[PDB]
Design a protein around this ligand. Structure first.
Ligand SMILES: CC(=O)O[C@H]1[C@H](C)[C@H](O)[C@H](C)[C@@H](O)[C@@H]([C@H](C)OC(=O)C(C)(C)CC(=O)O)CC/C=C(/C)C(=O)Nc2cc(O)c3c4c(c(C)c(O)c3c2O)O[C@](C)(O/C=C/[C@H](O[C@H]2C[C@@H]3OCO[C@@H]3[C@@H](C)O2)[C@H]1C)C4=O
Ligand SMILES: [Mg+2]
Lengths: 1339, 552, 69
């Protein structure tokens, strides 16, 4: 708040105007928040383990009045901690202990229990735990669960116009989608017949479900249709007329009452005629006996005398039928109100296609639909249909389902029952008919109000629920036969069944995946990710991939993969949040009257719909009145100019449209969206470097990405640094931030060189120095690819745009040797290689160091036990772990046998299985771990390690206690000196004896007490932490069946940079370093300074990304401000001269949001800042709020450098000039990890597959390249027959020709005696194994 | 067959075959036990079902494998698949003596060769190396030969140059489309893990340097070596089979060089002087006396073969420039000097190669084509062409055109509020006036950008085609196009909303200026649809070629 | 249409590649169809010289030996 302590070290000069009202929230919100609701104690039905329990519980037996209910649940402390869980390889998890209650009701009650045994916390399963950074450790490997996006449950009405039947006419269908349970589909057809289908199953006439709800034809007709009353009064047929019935119809006869003819025959009744009837209140008219020939009678009508049915309900009356129901004494006849435009006569004709009659009939016809071919049964059909949509067990919409359902049905209640009601289905049918009638619209799936966001917590809740249903069958099953007091709620509820539902998700699921950890941006951008397909959903359709108007501020427009799934991923936006109900909402600013108010307001996708939202980029001042009389705004799905005082809200930030990825691209507004996608897409691939650099050109998010992702080490509490080691950092907490008891100091243990998921190096460095004040929320130590708390994914360098003798040809990059000499793009890789000693039927394999047919030079690098020493530098082929496996009676041959007689060698009974270093990769062994089966005797090396780990543990634990004790006694010293101060007196006697001295009556005596209590706890907690650690060490690690022991060697390879490596800027510019050029031949400027990289200018115009050029220019300028300081610092001008110029930099001409110094202390503080600025002056280009040409050229003026951004350069070869200026500057460049010595493979003769003999890599010497169909055509188009035969015969599939060929290649005869490929030879046996006789004819 | 950790794994036929055997065996038994009719019929029906599941599964009940949900794969499913057969179908069998890796440039290569990583070649030619090692007697036996190259003994590298010398390798790229997707090269041993690919071929393959990876195949048998050299060889296919035009056309950097080489400004060093021949023209340029492009008369000797198979000679004073004089040094024999006397863009530079092929034949076109590349890259390098931010020039009248076209839109708006025009008639009107503006601004920055170098020779003024960097790129044909330049300086387009409509408020700014949130957000739909369309239409095209090669 | 005309192929091994394999095999096995190779697709399947290009000389040389004394 006016600048922090690690902010005092380096300040980034920030262009841009718009004040930031809201700051990037926690970027990990979604991932962390979700799992927090799942595992939690919620004193109610809110989603969580509590809620999932209350669903399946209590489980009661069948009538047996033996019930097993659920009390409460708890999470025990984890079995191993995160670090240990990772080393050993098991999952980081907590035991779930749930208190259960077994009640048995007396048989033939009044209900009362003979006995209820309460089983104390029966253990069911171990549910996994989430890291403080939101990853899970499944087996020793960090994993993220991606959030999923699906269609929210409720009711949804779609169209399906066009393609169906090609007659036009559209169609209208309704769909009820519950969170769990069967789907209910309603749909029309070309004849305007309403249909229903359960799941995707057979279509059934809609009315048939209503019958299953116990609705007779009369009440179904009575539900969906209005009543036309026909009166026989005096004689021949009167009728009631609602003056509104005549709209949209042409008069069919003389309509007359009250001695006045309102409408004549053939004149349609428009609003005028209707007005006359309405205002004249004409209730009853006289109608002809011929008008009812088409009108459908409503209820049943029988002849009172013969007691026989004259006409059944839903039958068309005729002029003759009126006679037969008129002479029976009927005054009134009810008919349907049917209008082909407003209220359609659909259901009436739907009944005519209905094969069923009564409820049992419909239930029969439904059950035979779901499970056909087998005879339906009454108890079965009734049970099934009641179990589909109406049972709390097999169906739930939950709250969101019920809420969106009721909300879309235009109801009041926003929360309700989790099942369907007769009212609900009838109401849904009513809504579908209303849309077909022209009133109402269909929703669209792509809108984010119908698109809901899941995440790990919700998924696990569902999975744990599944464990509970499959244990449920068991609980009832046992409670079926149970003896009274013998069994308890333990013998019944199992573990494996419940535990295995959750374990299968995190273990193998499309949503649990290796964290993309090559990179801090990689981590944080993976943890924020969306899916639109995956497991639960549609695993053509381009509509959903495309960008939607609701994506603004919710989903990133430009960060999505370019490929098979485009728009199928997205990423979460910068300020986006999971809605209370699970939608996606974005921040906004409330505009009351004419002022832009700083109250923030979160609007969901549908909430935002009706409001008018101003633009993030708008001009206001003073009181915050919109400067212009009209401002660009967007209201409902579209944007246009809006009046001064109209706007309800305004964008929070200029950023909120994009994502954390896109927000890191400087001058983004200047890059074409295709290359921008590619840019934000490639930035996650930057492998970290040896020297963490820092971006010279930036946005200002780099701090948030570094800190919010856990790669770094952040100060818990402020204080002064007591101790700084490359290992740990110990902070003496300030008293204002400190708790009363135990005092304290925060001991931060730094991560050291270690393997990332992608086999990159993740290593932390201390960024503060001994005894320096640090404030809460300050960066304590940098992580990989972070600088002084900011995010550096690569290293900026001097770049020149110009063709260099074609070495930059396509995207190829020409890099000076200076880059590789400076070791700046170097990368450290950590590979985990393993050696397993298994069990075979011939015998166990030994890890012994005695290996057949290897020299003393081979076995040198191994110890007595057979494992390579720590620190031994190794190369390709070197032996990491000696291993030998039994193979008996080799059965050699005559000439081999003579060979052994001459050279007198005893051929061993053991085969060489030793793990040896992969070919070509060379590094230093930085570690060895040895896991041994529990019960096999630990070997020498393994034993040394155990002792080593034991001693190392003790120093660490004691170290904790040692610093802790001094920190506590140092506080006792201060409290004892107030009120009883003895300065020299107190510190003479042994420190341990201080605790006796009490104090005068005061709270300080109670403070001394506190520190006492916490002291002794620490004394003992240390004891217990040490004991547990020791046991975890000595316990034999559990291994697989058959595995006696496993040795993991950890190699640290340092790869630098070479032709073939991938490099890219933030702007979507790829490249492959082509040649590495001497510093002598590099283009240089008049000053004699070479240039690091020569990029091709030709890549810029075609791909329109101009930011890369601004990024270059400003970069050059930034470097300018640095160089200038480097001169004033190398001149040691003074604090005064430097202070002036630096203030000059931070202002830069007008109207920026930066502010700045001369508050900073002119001596110790000012000089340190300039020293950190001397490399270049760090600059901030906000995303859409970013710098401008004028600001950039002006910074170049302060630079002493031309505005052009171009200089004179000289070819280092001829020493002669270059015609024209070339643009030189500093472009930030990432090294992606595609590095050529991963990708490169070659094979001569490798191993081969058993099923079909074909090249297959078994040594990781990769199987040969795959020759495809298209590649075959290419040989056929050329005339090359023999190249093709040798490709698909001798080189691959021919078990003979390969060997017959190989002997000739060395023999010096190039030929092939191809024979028949084993592929076809197999097809022959396969066809012939069928009843097909396939022979090869003739000769 | 067994696996590690002692578990076993086997084909699904076994689960199937076993059942057919069992039911069959039980049935045999049920006859000797004389079971009732109701049973032997049922056993017979059961036997029928198992035979069906073994043979073709899925035509009755779809039997599921033991303990495993997935229906067990049957004999019909072993032959069958997606599509037709698994054996030859994409894809399509793995093949020995191969490799692959990331590719880089190698402008040094002659058009017939390629950079092959040292290490790739050692493992690739391994049997050849072994036999040659003991053919010359540097290795006692094949085993010792293994140990020598396995040791990478210094003597083996020289033997590898032997096995490499005349021995082509096949290079292949990823979406093999026409037969040119595989071409033979002569390998040149290269330190490093990257494959180097002649730039001129990069076009036929559709191969970038942004990390595309390529595969190598060794032509083992003698018939394959002469096939590789005589059919699939690079130098033997220089022309696309779709149309006889050369596919070896100089690419981007090279054509920007020749464009900068043969070009002329109004006043330049050496203007007006005369030189004996191309030789002293180059002597003038490299020595710093004369500018590369200045109007100059020089004596040249051209040739026309207009005799009957015979080269005529004719010499004259041609009025030309210094650069064109120097470039003439590459052009072989019977081509007239006329071909290099023009400004030499990418289009003319292809027809140069074409005529060279149709007059002097193959061999001269190859060695010529190489030369064009070398010289193209080289002179382009001297030129110092670059792209700065001040290189993209926005028209001075732009703010005025947008403002004038914006009045039109508010006029049609006045007509719609007054009902003078229908909603649709309005919409169409506004779309057009905005449309006219785009053309107006575009052909504005193009006139200013194109000719604006305005210079003085001994007199007052004159104006020529601009020498501005970004313009040279588009005139030459190297990269960029009037459409893309227009997006940089003049306004860019009217984007379109996803449903296919076109927004009636174009993007009035461009990339030299900023695009704001809305302008950028709206651009997003076009980009997003763009990427999908190429990626689906890429796949859609392939399906077509499949159907096509099948019918022929 | 191109796709319709490729359906008919004298060689049944050619049709079994890209068509529905089950149907082709039955329909040929009933008629006892004799595939003479002679096409491209099938010779690749069976693993011999393509009856075009370098191989065109081979097949020719054999085809005349066939149906010949
Ligand atoms: C072994 C593994 O864990 O990889 C995981 C995981 C994606 C990654 O590894 C790693 C964290 C990776 O995210 C980064 C990394 C650098 O990757 C890449 O950048 C490249 C370029 C290589 C991406 C590519 O390959 O093109 C990059 C991320 C950046 C982007 C824009 C991106 O993510 N694009 C992307 C690409 C995909 O294709 C999928 C995908 C998928 C799901 C649910 C996704 O969200 C995907 C996705 O987002 O379902 C499919 C059918 O198959 C799913 C198979 C595997 O899942 C396991 C998970 C468990 O493992 C054991 O059982 C489980 C079961 C599902 O298999 C995959 C899902 C599937 O295609
Ligand atoms: Mg590419």
């Amino acid at each position: 708040m006016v600048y922090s302590y690690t902010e005092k070290k380096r300040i980034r000069k920030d262009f841009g105007k718009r004040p930031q009202v809201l700051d990037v929230p926690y970027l990990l919100s979604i991932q962390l928040d979700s799992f927090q609701k799942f595992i939690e104690q919620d004193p109610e039905g809110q989603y969580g383990l509590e809620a999932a329990f209350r669903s399946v519980f209590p489980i009661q037996s069948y009538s047996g009045n033996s019930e097993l209910q659920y009390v409460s649940y708890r999470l025990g402390e984890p079995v191993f901690d995160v670090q240990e869980c990772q080393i050993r390889g098991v999952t980081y998890s907590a035991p779930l202990r749930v208190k259960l209650r077994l009640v048995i009701y007396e048989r033939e009650a009044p209900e009362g229990t003979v006995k209820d045994i309460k089983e104390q916390e029966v253990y069911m399963g171990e549910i996994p735990l989430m890291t403080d950074n939101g990853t899970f450790v499944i087996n020793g490997t960090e994993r993220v669960i991606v959030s999923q996006l699906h269609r929210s449950p409720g009711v949804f009405f779609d169209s399906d116009k066009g393609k169906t039947h090609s007659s036009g006419k559209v169609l209208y269908n309704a769909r009820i989608i519950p969170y769990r349970g069967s789907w209910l589909d309603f749909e029309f057809d070309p004849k305007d017949n309403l249909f229903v289908r359960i799941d995707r199953r057979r279509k059934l006439p809609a009315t048939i479900i209503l019958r299953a709800l116990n609705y007779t034809t009369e009440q179904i007709l009575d539900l969906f249709f209005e009543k036309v009353i026909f009166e026989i009064r005096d004689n021949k047929l009167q009728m009631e007329l609602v003056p509104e019935r005549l709209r949209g119809e042409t008069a069919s006869f003389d309509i007359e009452a009250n001695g006045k003819v309102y409408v004549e025959k053939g004149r349609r009744i428009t609003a005028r005629h209707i007005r006359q009837l309405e205002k004249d209140d004409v209730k009853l008219i006289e109608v002809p006996v011929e008008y009812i020939a088409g009108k459908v009678v409503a209820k049943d009508y029988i002849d009172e005398s013969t007691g026989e049915l004259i006409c059944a309900a839903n039958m068309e009356l005729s002029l003759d039928l009126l006679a037969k129901l008129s002479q029976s004494g009927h005054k009134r006849i009810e008919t349907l109100f049917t209008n082909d435009l407003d209220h359609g006569p659909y259901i009436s004709e739907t009944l005519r296609v209905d094969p069923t009659n009564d409820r049992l009939s419909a239930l029969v016809e439904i059950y035979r639909m779901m499970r056909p071919g087998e005879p339906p049964t009454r108890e079965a059909a009734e049970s099934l249909f009641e179990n589909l949509f109406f049972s709390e067990d097999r169906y739930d919409l939950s709250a969101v389902g019920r809420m969106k359902f009721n909300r879309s049905l235009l109801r009041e209640e926003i929360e309700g029952s989790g099942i369907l009601s007769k009212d609900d289905i009838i109401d849904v049918m009513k809504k579908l008919i209303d849309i077909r009638n022209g009133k109402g619209e269909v929703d669209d799936i792509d809108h984010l109000g119908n698109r809901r966001i899941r995440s790990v917590g919700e998924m696990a809740e569902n999975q744990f629920r599944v464990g509970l249903v499959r244990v449920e069958r068991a609980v009832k099953e046992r409670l079926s036969l149970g003896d009274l007091d013998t069994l308890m709620p333990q013998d019944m509820i199992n573990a494996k069944p419940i535990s295995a539902a959750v374990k299968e998700f995190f273990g193998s699921s499309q949503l649990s995946q290796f964290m993309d950890q090559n990179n801090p941006l990689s981590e944080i951008t993976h943890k924020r990710r969306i899916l639109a397909l995956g497991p639960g959903g549609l695993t053509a359709g381009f509509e959903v991939r495309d960008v939607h108007p609701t994506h603004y501020g919710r989903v990133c427009p430009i960060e999505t993969p370019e490929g098979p799934n485009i728009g199928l991923i997205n990423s979460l936006s910068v300020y986006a949040q999971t809605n209370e109900y699970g939608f996606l909402e974005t921040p906004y600013r409330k505009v009351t009257d004419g002022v832009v108010t700083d109250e923030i307001h979160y609007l969901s996708a549908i909430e935002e719909g009706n409001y008018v939202i101003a633009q993030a980029n708008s001009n206001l001042d003073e009181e915050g009145h919109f400067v212009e009389d009209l401002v660009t705004c967007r209201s409902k799905g579209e944007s246009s100019l809006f009046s001064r005082d109209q706007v309800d809200y305004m964008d929070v930030s200029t950023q909120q449209v994009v994502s954390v990825g896109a927000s890191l691209i400087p001058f983004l507004e200047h890059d074409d969206a295709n290359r921008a996608l590619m840019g934000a897409n490639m930035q996650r691939q930057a492998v970290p470097t040896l020297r963490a650099d820092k971006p010279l050109v930036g946005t200002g998010m780099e701090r948030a990405v570094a800190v919010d992702s856990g790669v770094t080490a952040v100060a818990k509490r402020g204080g002064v640094v007591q101790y700084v080691d490359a290992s740990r950092i110990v902070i003496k907490v300030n008293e204002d931030e400190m708790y009363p008891g135990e005092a304290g100091i925060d001991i931060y243990n730094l991560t050291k060189y270690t393997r990332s998921n992608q086999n990159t190096c993740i290593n932390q460095m201390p960024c503060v120095s001994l005894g320096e004040p640090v404030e809460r929320g300050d960066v304590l130590a940098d992580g990989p690819s972070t600088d002084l708390g900011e995010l550096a994914l690569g290293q900026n360098m001097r770049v020149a745009f110009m063709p260099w003798n074609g070495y930059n040809f396509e995207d190829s990059i020409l890099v000076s040797e200076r880059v590789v000499q400076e070791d700046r793009f170097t990368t450290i890789h950590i590979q985990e290689l393993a050696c397993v000693s298994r069990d075979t039927k011939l015998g166990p394999e030994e890890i012994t160091a005695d290996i057949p047919n290897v020299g003393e030079a081979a076995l040198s690098k191994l110890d007595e036990s057979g494992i390579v020493y720590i620190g031994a530098e190794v190369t390709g082929g070197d032996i990491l772990v000696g291993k030998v496996t039994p193979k008996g009676e080799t059965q050699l041959t005559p000439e081999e046998k003579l060979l052994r007689a001459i050279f007198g060698e005893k051929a061993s009974d053991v085969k060489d299985s030793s793990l040896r270093v992969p070919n070509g990769v060379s590094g230093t062994v930085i570690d060895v771990q040895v896991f041994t089966r529990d019960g096999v005797e630990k070997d020498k090396r393994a034993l040394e390690i155990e002792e080593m780990q034991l001693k190392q543990a003790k120093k660490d634990l004691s170290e904790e206690l040692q610093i802790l004790e001094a920190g506590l006694f140092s506080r006792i010293r201060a409290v004892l000196v107030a009120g009883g101060v003895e300065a020299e007196k107190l510190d003479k006697l042994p420190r341990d004896r201080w605790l006796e001295l009490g104090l005068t009556d005061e709270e300080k005596q109670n403070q001394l007490e506190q520190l006492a209590e916490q002291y002794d706890e620490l004394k003992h907690e240390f004891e217990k932490k040490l004991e547990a650690k020791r046991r975890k060490i000595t316990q034999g690690d559990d291994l697989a069946p058959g595995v006696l022991k496993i040795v993991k060697v950890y190699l640290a390879v340092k790869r630098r940079i070479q032709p073939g490596d991938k490099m890219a800027g933030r702007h979507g510019n790829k490249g492959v370093i082509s040649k590495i050029n001497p510093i002598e031949d590099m283009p240089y400027d008049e000053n004699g300074t070479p240039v690091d990289i020569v990029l091709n200018p030709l890549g810029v115009p075609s791909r329109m990304n101009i930011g890369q050029i601004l990024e270059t220019h400003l970069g050059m300028a930034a470097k300018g401000i640095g160089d200038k300081i480097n001169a004033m610092l190398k001149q040691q001008q003074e604090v005064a001269k430097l202070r002036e110029f630096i203030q000059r930099a931070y202002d830069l001409g007008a109207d920026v949001r930066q502010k700045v110094d001369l508050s900073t202390f002119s001596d110790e503080e000012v000089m340190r800042l300039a020293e950190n600025l001397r490399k270049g002056m760090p600059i901030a280009t906000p995303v859409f709020d970013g710098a401008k040409e004028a600001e950039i050229k002006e910074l170049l003026k302060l630079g002493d450098l031309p505005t052009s951004g171009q200089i004179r350069l000289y070819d280092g070869r001829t020493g002669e000039q270059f015609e024209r200026p070339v643009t030189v500057g500093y472009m930030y460049m990432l090294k992606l990890n595609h590095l050529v010595d991963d990708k490169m493979h070659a094979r001569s003769t490798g191993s081969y597959s058993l099923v079909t003999q074909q090249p297959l890599g078994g040594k990781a010497q990769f199987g040969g390249q795959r020759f495809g169909e298209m590649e075959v055509w290419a040989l056929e188009a050329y005339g090359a027959a023999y190249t093709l035969q040798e490709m698909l015969t001798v080189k691959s599939d021919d078990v003979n020709g390969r060997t017959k060929m190989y002997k000739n290649i060395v023999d010096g005869n190039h030929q092939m005696e191809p024979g028949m490929p084993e592929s076809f030879n197999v097809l022959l046996k396969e066809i012939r194994s069928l009843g097909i006789n396939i022979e090869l004819e003739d000769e | 067959v067994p696996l590690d950790g002692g578990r076993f794994a086997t084909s699904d036929l076994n689960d199937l075959y076993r059942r057919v055997i069992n039911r069959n065996n039980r049935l045999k038994r049920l006859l000797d036990l004389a079971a009732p009719d109701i049973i032997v019929r049922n056993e017979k029906r059961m036997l029928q079902e198992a035979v069906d599941a073994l043979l073709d599964n899925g035509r009755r009940g779809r039997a599921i494998t033991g303990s495993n949900k997935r229906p067990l794969k049957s004999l019909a499913d072993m032959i069958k698949g997606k599509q037709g057969r698994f054996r030859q179908n994409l894809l399509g069998k793995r093949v020995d003596y191969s490799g692959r890796s990331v590719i880089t440039v190698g402008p040094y290569l002659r058009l017939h060769q390629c950079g092959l990583p040292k290490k790739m070649a050692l493992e690739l030619f391994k049997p050849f190396i072994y036999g040659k090692l003991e053919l010359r007697g540097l290795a006692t036996t094949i085993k010792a030969a293994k140990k020598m190259v396995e040791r990478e003994e210094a003597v083996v590298w020289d033997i590898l140059d032997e096995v490499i010398r005349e021995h082509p390798v096949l290079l292949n790229r990823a979406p093999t489309l026409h037969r040119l997707g595989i071409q033979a090269f002569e390998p040149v041993l290269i330190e490093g893990k990257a494959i180097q690919l002649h730039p001129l071929v990069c076009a036929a393959y559709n191969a970038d340097f942004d990390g595309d990876q390529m595969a190598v195949h060794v032509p083992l048998t003698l018939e394959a070596q002469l096939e590789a050299r005589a059919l699939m060889m690079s130098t033997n296919n220089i022309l696309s089979p779709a149309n006889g035009e050369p596919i070896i056309v100089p690419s981007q950097d090279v054509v920007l060089g020749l464009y900068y080489m043969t070009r002329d400004c109004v006043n330049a060093k050496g203007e007006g002087m005369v030189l004996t021949g191309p030789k002293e023209a180059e002597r003038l340029y490299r020595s710093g006396l004369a500018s590369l492009h200045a109007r100059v008369k020089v004596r040249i000797t051209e040739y026309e073969k207009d005799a009957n198979g015979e080269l005529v000679a004719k010499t004259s004073l041609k009025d030309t420039t210094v650069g064109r004089a120097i470039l003439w040094m590459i052009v072989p024999k019977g081509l007239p000097y006329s071909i290099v006397n023009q400004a030499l863009g990418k289009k003319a530079i292809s027809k140069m190669l074409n005529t060279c092929y149709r007059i002097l034949g193959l061999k001269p076109t190859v060695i010529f084509a190489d030369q064009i590349m070398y010289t193209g890259f080289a002179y382009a390098a001297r030129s110092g062409a670059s792209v700065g931010i001040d290189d993209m020039v926005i028209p001075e009248k732009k703010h005025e055109i947008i403002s004038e076209a914006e009045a039109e839109v508010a006029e049609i708006q006045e007509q719609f509020q007054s009902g003078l025009v229908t909603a649709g008639e309005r919409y169409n009107k506004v779309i057009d006036i905005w449309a006219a503006a785009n053309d107006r601004v575009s052909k504005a920055m193009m006139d200013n950008l194109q000719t604006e170098t305005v210079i003085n020779r001994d007199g007052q003024e004159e104006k020529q085609v601009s020498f501005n960097s970004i313009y040279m790129m588009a005139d030459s044909g190297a990269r960029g196009s009037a459409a893309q330049i227009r997006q940089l300086a003049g306004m860019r387009g009217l984007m379109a909303k996803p449903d296919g409509s076109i927004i009636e408020t174009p993007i009035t700014a461009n990339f030299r200026e900023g695009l704001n949130v809305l302008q950028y957000f709206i651009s997003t739909h076009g980009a997003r649809k763009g990427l999908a369309d190429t990626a689906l239409k890429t796949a859609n095209s392939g399906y077509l070629t499949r159907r096509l090669v099948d019918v022929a | 249409g191109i796709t319709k005309a490729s359906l008919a192929t004298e060689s049944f091994i050619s049709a079994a590649s890209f068509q529905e394999t089950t149907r082709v095999l039955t329909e040929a096995a009933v008629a006892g169809k004799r595939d003479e190779l002679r096409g491209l697709k099938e010779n690749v399947i069976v693993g011999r010289l393509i009856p075009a290009g370098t191989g065109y000389a081979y097949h020719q040389d054999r085809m005349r030996r066939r149906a010949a004394g």
